[PDB]
Design a protein around this ligand. Structure first.
Ligand SMILES: *[C@@H]1O[C@H](CO)[C@@H](O[C@@H]2O[C@H](CO)[C@@H](O)[C@H](O)[C@H]2NC(C)=O)[C@H](O)[C@H]1NC(C)=O
Lengths: 48, 47
């Protein structure tokens, strides 16, 4: 017989923070022997 | 793109052995004669 109007709310995720990782700073920071041994694995860091 | 090691190094470490203190014995106020030539052995110390 009598009515009213009510409101709700919701949140749907759409985006995500973008992350960028490199091998020149995570595995071998600045050393040369590590880089020489890392290149032995081939293109293992080109896929990440 | 791409993302050097300076030769300047800081080396600090607390010594584990005391100083030899050879200058204190050489500069002693008592000078032995050539017939005496007192001897002191220094071992396990830093100089
Ligand atoms: C439907 O409900 C609303 C809210 O309860 C009624 O509005 C109230 O009505 C009384 C009586 O006239 C007033 O004293 C209030 O001040 C009103 N409140 C508001 C927020 O408007 C409304 O009268 C009801 N309708 C019917 C047909 O019963």
């Amino acid at each position: 017989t009598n009515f009213t109007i009510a409101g709700h709310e919701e949140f749907i995720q759409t985006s995500s923070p973008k992350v960028t990782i490199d091998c020149s700073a995570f595995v071998c920071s600045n050393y040369a022997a590590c880089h020489d041994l890392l290149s032995e694995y081939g293109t293992f860091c080109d896929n990440i | 793109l791409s993302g050097v090691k300076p030769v300047a190094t800081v080396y600090r470490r607390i010594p584990n052995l005391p100083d030899c203190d050879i200058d204190n014995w050489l500069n002693n106020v008592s000078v032995p004669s050539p017939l005496n030539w007192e001897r002191r052995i220094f071992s396990n110390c830093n100089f």
